[PDB]
Enzyme design. Structure first.
Site, PDB file in Angstrom:
ATOM      1  CG  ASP E  55      -1.874   1.198   1.148  1.00 18.03           C
ATOM      2  OD1 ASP E  55      -2.099   1.925   0.034  1.00 18.03           O
ATOM      3  OD2 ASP E  55      -2.322   1.509   2.418  1.00 18.03           O
ATOM      4  CB  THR E  88      -3.197   5.249  -0.524  1.00 12.89           C
ATOM      5  OG1 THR E  88      -2.685   3.968  -0.488  1.00 12.89           O
ATOM      6  CG2 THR E  88      -4.560   5.056   0.596  1.00 12.89           C
ATOM      7  CB  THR E  89      -0.907   3.041  -4.561  1.00  8.90           C
ATOM      8  OG1 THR E  89      -0.648   2.229  -3.271  1.00  8.90           O
ATOM      9  CG2 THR E  89       0.418   2.949  -5.327  1.00  8.90           C
ATOM     10  CG  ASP E 386      -6.288  -1.324   2.237  1.00 11.35           C
ATOM     11  OD1 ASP E 386      -6.400  -0.671   3.176  1.00 11.35           O
ATOM     12  OD2 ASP E 386      -5.265  -1.732   1.587  1.00 11.35           O
TER      13      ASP E 386
HETATM   14  N1  LIG Z   1      -7.728  -7.136 -11.289  1.00 13.07           N
HETATM   15  C1  LIG Z   1      -7.293  -6.152 -11.982  1.00 13.07           C
HETATM   16  N2  LIG Z   1      -6.840  -5.734 -13.048  1.00 13.07           N
HETATM   17  C2  LIG Z   1      -6.756  -4.518 -13.647  1.00 13.07           C
HETATM   18  N3  LIG Z   1      -6.476  -3.258 -13.097  1.00 13.07           N
HETATM   19  C3  LIG Z   1      -6.794  -3.331 -11.544  1.00 13.07           C
HETATM   20  C4  LIG Z   1      -7.152  -4.809 -11.085  1.00 13.07           C
HETATM   21  N4  LIG Z   1      -7.527  -4.665  -9.757  1.00 13.07           N
HETATM   22  C5  LIG Z   1      -7.198  -3.285  -9.388  1.00 13.07           C
HETATM   23  N5  LIG Z   1      -7.020  -2.554 -10.617  1.00 13.07           N
HETATM   24  C6  LIG Z   1      -6.578  -1.220 -10.625  1.00 13.07           C
HETATM   25  O1  LIG Z   1      -5.811  -0.675  -9.684  1.00 13.07           O
HETATM   26  C7  LIG Z   1      -6.077   0.311  -9.103  1.00 13.07           C
HETATM   27  C8  LIG Z   1      -5.890   0.429  -7.626  1.00 13.07           C
HETATM   28  O2  LIG Z   1      -6.686  -0.812  -6.979  1.00 13.07           O
HETATM   29  P1  LIG Z   1      -6.066  -1.451  -5.746  1.00 13.07           P
HETATM   30  O3  LIG Z   1      -4.785  -2.110  -5.746  1.00 13.07           O
HETATM   31  O4  LIG Z   1      -7.347  -2.059  -5.048  1.00 13.07           O
HETATM   32  O5  LIG Z   1      -5.974   0.249  -4.739  1.00 13.07           O
HETATM   33  P2  LIG Z   1      -4.368   0.585  -4.214  1.00 13.07           P
HETATM   34  O6  LIG Z   1      -3.852   1.260  -5.178  1.00 13.07           O
HETATM   35  O7  LIG Z   1      -5.001   1.250  -2.876  1.00 13.07           O
HETATM   36  O8  LIG Z   1      -3.898  -0.701  -3.611  1.00 13.07           O
HETATM   37  C9  LIG Z   1      -7.600   0.705  -9.492  1.00 13.07           C
HETATM   38  O9  LIG Z   1      -7.937   2.016 -10.054  1.00 13.07           O
HETATM   39  C10 LIG Z   1      -7.718  -0.456 -10.601  1.00 13.07           C
HETATM   40  O10 LIG Z   1      -8.053   0.203 -12.061  1.00 13.07           O
END
Ligand SMILES: Nc1ncnc2c1ncn2[C@@H]1O[C@H](COP(=O)(O)OP(=O)(O)O)[C@@H](O)[C@H]1O
Ligand SMILES: Nc1nc2c(ncn2[C@@H]2O[C@H](COP(=O)(O)OP(=O)(O)OP(=O)(O)O)[C@@H](O)[C@H]2O)c(=O)[nH]1
Ligand SMILES: Nc1ncnc2c1ncn2[C@@H]1O[C@H](COP(=O)(O)OP(=O)(O)O)[C@@H](O)[C@H]1O
Ligand SMILES: Nc1ncnc2c1ncn2[C@@H]1O[C@H](COP(=O)(O)OP(=O)(O)O)[C@@H](O)[C@H]1O
Ligand SMILES: Nc1ncnc2c1ncn2[C@@H]1O[C@H](COP(=O)(O)OP(=O)(O)O)[C@@H](O)[C@H]1O
Ligand SMILES: [Mg+2]
Ligand SMILES: [Mg+2]
Lengths: 50, 51, 538, 412, 520, 154, 103, 77
Positions: E55, E88-89, E386
């Protein structure tokens, strides 16, 4: 892949080389000439000082 | 053990507080002696009036 | 990116972070590689002055030697956390994470992604959980087989200590564990079983005491040493003076009020002693034959010790919190804290109470109970490290054998679990599994990493590790077709296979389950990390 | 009563305790081997307050030194003063509190405290007159603060009445580099006040000033600081180990110096920091001799208590008090305790301990750092992770509002 | 000399150049920490611990940068975490690009830093419009879709393999804290950890979990229907507020003073037994004597319980915070307690309190975590924060935006199309907003290992013609629509990402000079 | 070539920590470390034994011929030698007789073991050898006993 | 978790050697760093260009809007800049003008 | 044993010498393998005198850069 722990960035100019941008340096250059000018200000005239 | 301090409200207690002690200590000591003891081993510091 | 932000920092990324986690893993693995197994080498730890403490437990090695690497501190918490609740499987977690990283790192160099590799470990882990159900065997506790508990106790004790200490200390554990099983079937280890240090003749003279032993005795000489029938009394009330919440001066006026007041000060102690005398009057019959003993959790005033000495009542002060929670189990009585409401029902029973002293210290022994619900294990030893070695051996031995009674299953060891998972993961049809793509090597990496543990046992004996598995592989090839269900082992004495069912080598159920679960989580998290850095205010 | 146990916890605790024993042992006379080469009854007849006579007269102090960093304990032990303390007493366990109240405290109370309750029990069973416990902790560190809080609580449970004296070392704002010092020092007082019975405040920042001003050592070393702390401790303990009646015995000290329960904190004052009773009078009450950062002149003294030593009569001190009360009236309070023995090295000293509203400055400060510099919820995740919640921090700041209020309530 | 300044005044254009390079450097640290194939990060704090995570917020908490422009970028993660709790990222990686794309112009085409701000608010106003149009509503009561909505964020973490259990774990916890608008808060969500065990047997249980055991051995370890009563006060005699000083004259006073100490604890215990409770939970400590007669009625005594753990017990058992014991009644006594039981674990004892389960105050609960080690617990605990953060947005806002970069790519296309019709001086910064919004799918393709040249070219060709729900599959690296892919995220996270990223650029763009070392 | 890599992966532990395995003749060195103070004990065994000036930290001196008493004051670095200190300390506390026999016998068992380990005998068999010798040694001490006191006061 | 393992390829090339490869970010480090000296030749370009005063280590002062002459005296530690330095000198020894256009 | 002969000497034997030989070879491999093939990367040998030189041959890279490890000297030779 890297040779060691960390890698500090390179300064473009040599270490200790003074440089400045903007209108501050040309004002400092003009003020430097005015500083030399004030030494010769009262010397001018047939009623000046050595 | 908890805050041993004198308290004398009037002169009648002031006169008797000094000799009261003599008498009491003397009594305990005489008691000890009628039993025919001639040496006592003490465990800590001994007072002068008892001595 | 970090040097222009922070004027001073260190950063490793994308090749050194992988080499660090593998190099630190192989480094820490080499430390605990030689200790694993029965013929492993001992390891002392002398810190500052030269305090000496000797044991083979990986937790003691990790939680006493300070470590600077960021990878090993996670292996230290993982090896410690698995052992702190289970009591066994410490070095097994280090060997799995120590081997699974290097066994996957060769394929990271080939160019396989870390994400799909760890996806193969997780789906392979679920296959091992399904395999534990078929691999385990049911055992009924109603039989109350004492020979089965003896063989389980020798599995852990042979690893730590030699056969001379194992044979004399094994039935000490079995007699303590035989009383654990009851109708309620509620396991209780910390309150029931205890360990106490005592510098005495030798480690071999460790004996089992059915009652609760205490590290204190009678202060006065005239108080009785030995008592035949001693009815205990529990009282958490403090019988020395009580200071009294802001109460101040005994303002005395004449000299007499002083004597009077000191006498007064005691009256509070005699008010509680009179309740004990009133209780003794009810149980006054057979006073020379029988006896009475009082055990207090807080200190007793020395002025009141002469009261107990005149009535020949044994006095014991400043007991532990745990011992007050154990007198009811041993003597069978009930606890009491105040002196107002007393009865003869709460008094316990004891068949023999005697004291023995050495040097300045004095110990009180209680035993010969009618129906003791608890007991103790008084371990003897020569040196301080001898007690520490017996501490870790008894601490790890009681937890290993206690888990067998928690569940109705037991896992055979000696590499049978790891060798069985090797053939299962390497021969199982992949179409049944849901993993596809580059998960081919993830199954082979984790399946091949389990083989390094049973040969680490061989590396301490000095034989060739690859050759002593040849007949093991040939045995299982014919065992499936021979229509005979048998489990092979690894005997280090002769360098040949064996059967743990008849030899008595066994292992607990939750040790191998929690070990692979904790090891797979730590090893997966270390593989996905591709950057190391240090930053903060100090 | 006859005896008092002395727990020492933390790197600061162990250092100050080692210095304190180095002072005490030489004071009433024992080579570091335990043998008594002293002259005579006066030094021996109250030796049972802090030493256990063993058969053969190998006196051994009753101290429980504890730390979660093997190293500090080890250093002290391998050093001199390593035969006195019994080997079994030391209780030391890896890793390091890590300079966190939350973590260090919870994690190792979970383990080290159990072992400590075990040592505090049997070794003490050995006496017939527990009177209380003296703890030396550092308010701002990790192990010491956390464990101290836990232990104080645990002991108080196993020993209700027993008095409880502390000598916590308050943090130095300037010279305490670590940023999370106030945020620990706050959580420690939360529980120090609810349990303790008398505590003494020593500030490293104040210790630096006195080290560089009077002693004039160019760079203070923790050693110097330790020696000064040791001297005040020695005076307060002589108030105890020398036969005397003026403040005879701990509980008395407490009764005399504590007006109301929620005010434990004392300002030590000691002189002749490097003689006639009139000369030492000024040195005790000089605003620069306080080992507390807050100025006492701006504040208000509540109960004064001066402990003299060496050759001093009744009237030397009484006349001095009469003269002093007359001029500092705006600032009748007095309590004298003459001793007979003298400081090792110096003929006569005079320790000074007065309750003062001025402590509220040293707490308004700490509360200001705690709140303002952690309204931004800085460095808090280190504490929430251990398990303790933020409601507890709100309770902690709330209870300092309270402390400050109290001092303000007793109209500064 | 003059005032404490003028060491080396970075003035003019080079000052802003260092800020864009410094702001870009923050995003480069966590460039690989995005997408389903994201890598982990082990940071070493100077105290002695370790933080293992991916994160961006938890990474940037431990890092320390001695630069004032990068610290404003550091604080944006606290804006996202303490607003929703997810993405957050995404906030840190988008802003870097916005500051970077606007830079060409600042450096070369000389557009003054105020005209860029005016261009961004109209882009911000249009960004909320297209994000509102691209999002589709979803039913809140559908548990089948709610499980797939919760596991969208879990898919980018380590516990995707246990996603079948975590969605059931998070869904039951959110509905417990949810109050019947639909406001919930995570302060009652207990984050208590248990080192060791398997994740499969780990489950949420209604009620609390203490770290302590009973005091006396005779206390009942198994009660059918506990009746909990909370106490704040010391149950023991206490010194008291004023200067007291009892003066004793007669010998029959000191034993009376010590006897009333026994009778006062009897008086407070006897009035507690008027209602006859089974479990008495005291906030402060307990005495050895009062506990003794608490026993003469059938209660159960515990050690000192911190305040926090009592406010959760008040909502579970329905009791009230009580300090004055004389005013104790039968109505404020806790009831409807399911079961009481104490398990044996080598770390510490653990007392379980179960609820009968059968409006009123919102109920609390404790989520059991059975990880592999200590770092695995802290890793999984942040995943629940999260994962449970996603469940709040669907209740507060029924809208649901597409994931996989489809939402931000939709912002890129409409801003690019409308930039041609926006002829003027604002056209160059307005068109540069689309250049950064198309990077958050570019980062997914880079982590997946594919070529983002042809994928983004194929993306824009199909986005206008095919549908508005097109996106990139992070695992396979091919174009797959979000409708068939079955993964969706809330629309609230997309709003905070666009708002916080643009609002951060408006602050940093106004920086002219940097002067360090003035005073404290 | 100018400098080695100086033991890589050494940052796993602290710089002050050192390992000492059985190889590199270190078990022979531990036998030699016993041989340093063992030769001091030879000159102190028997009626013609010579006392020892063991001045200490304080200055407090003791002159003596007992193995358990002299080893209390000497601060020892080698842990294997400290086993003999605590072994003789156990002898003094329990029986109070025969401490020099413990030091001189256990030191010579390590001396003759220097020849056995050099020959190639495994360490596991060495412990089994002395244990089987110990059971026969303690058995024969009861067999060859002669005489008895039979009176408490004479 | 205090001291790192110190990159165990430290047995390889000495501490004075610094590697700044890609993926780590070399291109981003370089194209940018050189923007400072890019503005030097950009400001000195054209008929209204500004000459730049360069004082060498000996003290011989030179004032020029001619870019080349400039980079000959500048002691530049960055190696990627030096590719542009002598590449401009090739234009000087050969064509003779445009020193500033090629840079 | 070597310290008794020369206190200023050192020795790694049978596990530390093997890791040094393999890690130095893998460390030399990881740096120098990138030049293999037409798509390899260019190295800039910038010495203290500021001399810049582009090359991909392993001979001139190892000749200018002095080797500290004893294993990689044998590979450079
Ligand atoms: N399985 C997936 N395939 C493609 N893009 C994804 C997938 N899961 C998440 N994302 C992308 O990653 C971004 C961040 O998601 P997430 O990792 O849940 O949040 P964080 O950046 O806080 O860890 C989202 O905007 C989404 O578009
Ligand atoms: N007055 C005084 N304070 C000291 C001395 N040595 C250390 N300290 C204080 O100790 C504090 C930090 O030390 P501690 O908190 O005790 O360290 P610790 O947490 O016990 O160490 P770990 O358990 O290893 O983390 C600082 O605030 C110092 O002011 C000393 O000699 N005198
Ligand atoms: N006498 C023996 N024969 C065969 N295998 C053994 C023997 N003793 C121990 N083992 C094996 O060694 C392994 C480790 O045992 P143990 O010491 O209890 O755990 P750990 O080494 O993780 O602390 C077990 O899997 C067990 O099967
Ligand atoms: N006068 C003597 N003649 C022959 N042998 C002796 C004489 N005195 C002592 N010895 C022998 O020397 C041995 C020395 O024993 P030692 O270990 O010194 O006893 P201790 O335990 O009292 O030190 C004794 O066992 C004894 O057999
Ligand atoms: N009076 C003018 N009007 C328009 N352009 C001019 C004028 N004077 C100079 N220039 C332009 O300024 C430019 C300066 O180019 P310059 O860098 O000196 O050429 P080079 O790089 O070949 O040395 C020339 O290309 C020229 O076209
Ligand atoms: Mg084991
Ligand atoms: Mg997310």
């Amino acid at each position: 892949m890297n040779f060691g722990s960390q890698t500090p960035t390179i300064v473009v100019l040599k270490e200790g080389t003074d440089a400045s941008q903007g209108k501050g340096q040309i004002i400092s250059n003009i003020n430097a000439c005015v500083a030399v000018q004030e030494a010769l200000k009262p010397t001018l005239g047939p009623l000046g000082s050595d | 053990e908890t805050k041993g301090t004198v308290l004398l409200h009037n002169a009648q207690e002031m006169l008797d507080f000094s000799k009261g002690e003599e008498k009491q200590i003397d009594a305990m000591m005489k008691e000890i002696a009628d039993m025919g003891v001639e040496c006592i081993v003490a465990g800590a510091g001994v007072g002068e009036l008892a001595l | 990116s970090l040097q222009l932000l922070n004027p001073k920092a260190e950063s490793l990324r994308r090749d050194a972070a992988l080499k660090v986690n593998v190099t630190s893993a192989e480094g820490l693995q080499s430390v605990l590689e030689t200790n694993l197994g029965p013929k492993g080498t001992l390891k002392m730890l002398v810190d500052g002055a030269g305090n000496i403490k000797l044991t083979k437990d990986g937790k003691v090695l990790l939680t006493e030697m300070q470590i600077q690497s960021p990878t090993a501190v996670l292996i230290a918490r993982a090896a410690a956390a698995q052992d702190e609740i289970t009591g066994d499987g410490t070095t097994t977690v280090v060997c799995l994470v120590g081997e699974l990283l290097r066994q996957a790192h060769r394929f990271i160099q080939e160019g396989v992604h870390p994400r799909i590799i760890t996806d193969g470990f997780e789906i392979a882990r679920k296959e091992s959980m399904k395999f534990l159900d078929e691999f385990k065997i049911s055992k009924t506790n109603l039989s109350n087989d004492r020979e089965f508990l003896l063989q389980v106790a020798r599995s852990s004790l042979l690893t730590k200590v030699d056969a001379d200490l194992t044979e004399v200390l094994t039935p000490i554990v079995t007699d303590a564990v035989l009383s654990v099983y009851d109708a309620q079937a509620d396991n209780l280890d910390l309150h029931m079983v205890e360990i106490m240090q005592m510098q005495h003749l030798s480690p071999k003279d460790t004996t089992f005491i059915k009652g609760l032993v205490l590290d204190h005795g009678g202060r006065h000489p005239d108080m009785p040493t030995r008592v035949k029938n001693a009815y205990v009394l529990i009282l958490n009330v403090s019988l020395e003076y009580e200071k009294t919440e802001v109460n101040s001066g005994f303002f005395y006026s004449s000299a007499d009020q002083r004597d009077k007041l000191a006498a007064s000060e005691r009256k509070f102690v005699d008010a509680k002693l009179k309740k004990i005398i009133d209780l003794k009057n009810e149980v006054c019959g057979m006073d020379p034959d029988k006896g009475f003993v009082i055990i207090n959790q807080k200190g007793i005033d020395p002025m009141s010790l002469d009261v107990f000495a005149k009535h020949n009542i044994l006095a014991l002060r400043r007991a532990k919190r745990r011992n007050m929670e154990r007198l009811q189990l041993v003597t069978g009585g009930e606890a009491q804290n105040s002196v107002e409401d007393l009865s003869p029902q709460i008094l316990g029973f004891s068949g023999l109470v005697y004291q023995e002293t050495i040097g300045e210290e004095k110990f009180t022994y209680v035993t010969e109970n009618t129906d003791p619900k608890s007991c103790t294990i008084l371990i003897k030893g020569s040196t301080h490290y001898a007690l520490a070695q017996t501490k870790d051996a008894v601490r790890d031995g009681l937890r290993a054998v206690a888990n067998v009674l928690k569940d109705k299953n037991i896992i055979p060891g000696a590499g049978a679990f790891y060798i069985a998972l090797s053939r299962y993961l390497r021969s199982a049809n992949m179409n049944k599994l849901g993993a596809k793509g580059k998960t081919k090597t993830g199954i082979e990496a984790f399946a091949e990493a389990l083989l390094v543990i049973p040969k680490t046992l061989v590396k301490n004996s000095g034989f060739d590790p690859l050759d002593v598995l040849a007949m093991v592989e040939d045995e299982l090839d014919d065992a499936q077709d021979s229509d005979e269900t048998r489990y092979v082992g690894v005997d280090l004495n002769i360098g040949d296979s064996c059967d743990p069912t008849i030899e008595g080598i066994w292992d607990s159920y939750r040790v191998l389950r929690n070990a692979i679960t904790g090891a797979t989580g730590i090893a997966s998290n270390l593989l996905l990390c591709d950057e190391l850095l240090r930053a903060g205010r100090s | 009563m006859r005896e008092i146990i002395h727990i020492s916890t933390g790197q600061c605790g162990n250092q100050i305790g080692a210095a304190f024993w180095e002072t005490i042992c030489g004071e009433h006379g024992l080579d570091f081997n335990g043998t008594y080469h002293g002259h005579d009854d006066i030094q021996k007849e109250r030796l049972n307050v802090y030493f256990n006579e063993a058969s053969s007269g190998k006196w051994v102090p009753r101290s429980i030194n504890v730390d979660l960093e093997p190293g500090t304990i080890d250093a002290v032990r391998n050093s001199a003063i390593g035969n006195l303390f019994r080997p079994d007493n030391y209780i030391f366990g890896q890793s390091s509190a890590g300079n966190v109240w939350a973590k260090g405290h919870y994690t190792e109370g979970a383990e080290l405290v159990d072992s400590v309750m075990d040592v505090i029990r049997r070794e003490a069973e050995g006496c017939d007159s527990l009177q209380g416990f003296q703890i030396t902790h550092s308010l701002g560190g990790g192990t010491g603060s956390g464990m101290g809080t836990l232990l104080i609580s645990k002991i108080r449970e196993e020993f209700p009445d027993r008095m409880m004296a502390t000598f916590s070392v308050l943090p130095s704002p300037k010279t305490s580099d670590t940023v999370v010092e106030p945020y620990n020092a706050t959580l420690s007082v939360h529980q120090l006040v609810e349990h303790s019975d008398e505590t003494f405040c020593i500030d490293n920042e104040a210790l630096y000033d006195i080290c560089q001003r009077t002693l004039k050592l160019n760079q203070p070393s923790y050693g110097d600081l330790n020696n000064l702390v040791s001297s005040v401790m020695s005076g307060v303990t002589t108030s105890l180990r020398y036969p005397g009646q003026l403040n005879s015995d701990l509980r008395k000290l407490a009764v005399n110096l504590v007006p109301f329960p929620r005010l434990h904190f004392f300002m030590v004052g000691y002189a002749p920091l490097t003689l006639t009773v009139p000369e030492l009078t000024q040195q005790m009450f000089d605003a620069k001799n306080m080992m507390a950062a807050a100025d006492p002149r701006n504040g208000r003294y509540l109960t004064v208590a001066a402990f003299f030593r060496g050759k001093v009569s009744v009237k030397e001190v009484e006349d001095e008090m009469h003269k002093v009360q007359s001029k500092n009236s705006d600032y009748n309070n007095v309590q004298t305790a003459v001793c007979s023995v003298a400081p090792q090295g110096l003929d006569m000293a005079a320790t000074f301990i007065a309750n003062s509203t001025s402590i509220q400055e040293l707490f308004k400060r700490v509360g200001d750092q705690f709140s303002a510099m952690f309204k931004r919820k800085a460095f808090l995740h280190w504490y929430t992770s251990e398990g303790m919640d933020e409601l507890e921090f709100s309770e902690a700041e709330s209870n300092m509002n309270d402390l400050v209020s109290e001092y303000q309530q007793y109209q500064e | 000399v003059f005032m404490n300044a003028s060491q080396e005044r970075t003035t003019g254009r080079q000052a802003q150049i260092s800020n864009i390079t410094a702001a870009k450097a923050v995003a480069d640290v966590i460039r690989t920490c995005l997408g389903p194939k994201a890598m982990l990060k082990m940071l070493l704090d100077p105290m002695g611990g370790l933080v293992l995570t991916n994160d961006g917020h938890a990474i940037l908490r431990e890092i320390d940068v001695a630069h004032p422009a990068a610290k404003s970028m550091l604080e944006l993660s606290r804006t996202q975490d303490e607003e929703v709790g997810d993405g957050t990222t995404t906030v840190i990686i988008l802003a870097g690009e916005i500051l970077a794309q606007c830079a060409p112009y600042l450096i070369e085409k000389n557009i003054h830093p105020v005209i860029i701000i005016q261009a961004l608010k109209k882009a911000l106003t249009d960004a909320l419009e297209v994000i509102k149009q691209v999002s589709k509503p979803v039913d809140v009561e559908n548990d089948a879709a709610m499980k797939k909505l919760i596991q969208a964020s879990i898919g980018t973490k380590y516990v995707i393999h246990w996603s079948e259990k975590m969605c059931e774990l998070a869904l039951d916890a959110v509905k417990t804290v949810r109050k019947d608008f639909e406001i919930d808060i995570k302060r009652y969500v207990r984050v208590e950890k248990i080192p060791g065990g398997d994740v499969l047997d780990s489950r949420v249980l209604k009620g609390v979990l203490l770290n302590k055991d009973v005091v006396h051995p005779k206390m009942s370890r198994h009660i059918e229907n506990p009746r909990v009563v909370l106490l704040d006060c010391p149950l023991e005699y206490k010194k008291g507020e004023s200067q007291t000083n009892i003066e004793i004259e007669k010998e029959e006073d000191w034993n009376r003073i010590l006897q009333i100490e026994e009778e006062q604890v009897q008086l407070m215990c006897e009035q507690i037994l008027a209602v006859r409770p089974t479990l008495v939970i005291t906030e402060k400590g307990v005495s050895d004597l009062a506990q003794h007669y608490l026993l003469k009625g059938g209660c159960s005594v515990l050690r000192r319980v911190k305040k926090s753990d009592n406010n959760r017990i008040a909502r579970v058992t329905g009791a009230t915070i009580v300090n004055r014991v004389e005013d104790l009644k039968e109505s404020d006594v806790g009831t409807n307690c399911g079961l009481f039981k104490v398990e044996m674990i080598g770390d510490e004892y653990f007392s379980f309190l179960d609820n009968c389960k059968e409006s009123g105050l919102q109920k609390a609960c404790t989520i059991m975590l059975r990880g592999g080690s200590k770092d695995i617990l802290n890793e999984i605990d942040r995943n629940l924060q999260d994962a449970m953060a996603v469940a709040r947005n669907v209740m507060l806002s029924p809208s649901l935006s597409p994931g996989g970069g489809a939402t931000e790519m939709a912002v890129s296309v409409k801003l690019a199309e409308k930039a041609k019709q926006l002829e003027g001086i604002q056209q160059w910064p307005y068109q540069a907003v689309a250049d950064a919004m198309e990077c958050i799918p570019r980062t997914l393709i880079q982590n997946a290992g594919g070529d983002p040249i042809r994928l983004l070219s194929q993306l824009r060709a199909k986005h206008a013609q095919g549908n508005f729900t097109t996106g990139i599959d992070g695992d396979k690296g091919k174009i797959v629509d979000m409708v068939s892919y079955g993964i969706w995220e809330p629309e609230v996270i997309k709003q905070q990402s666009v708002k916080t990223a643009i609002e951060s650029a408006c602050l940093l763009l106004r920086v002219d000079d940097i002067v360090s070392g003035v005073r404290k | 070539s100018l400098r080695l890599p100086q033991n890589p992966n050494a940052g796993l532990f602290k710089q002050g920590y050192n390992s000492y395995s059985n190889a590199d003749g270190q078990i022979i060195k531990s036998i030699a470390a016993i041989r340093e103070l063992h030769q001091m004990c030879l000159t102190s065994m028997g009626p013609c034994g010579r006392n020892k000036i063991i001045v200490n930290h304080l200055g407090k001196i003791i002159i003596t011929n007992d193995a358990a008493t002299m080893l209390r004051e000497l601060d020892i670095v080698h842990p294997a030698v400290k086993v003999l200190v605590m072994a003789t300390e156990q002898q003094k506390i329990d029986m109070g007789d025969g401490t020099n026999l413990v030091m001189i016998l256990a030191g010579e068992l390590l001396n003759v073991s220097e020849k056995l380990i050099s020959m190639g005998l495994s360490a596991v068999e060495i412990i089994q050898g002395y244990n089987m010798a110990r059971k026969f040694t303690l058995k024969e001490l009861d067999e060859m006993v002669v005489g008895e006191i039979t009176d408490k006061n004479d």
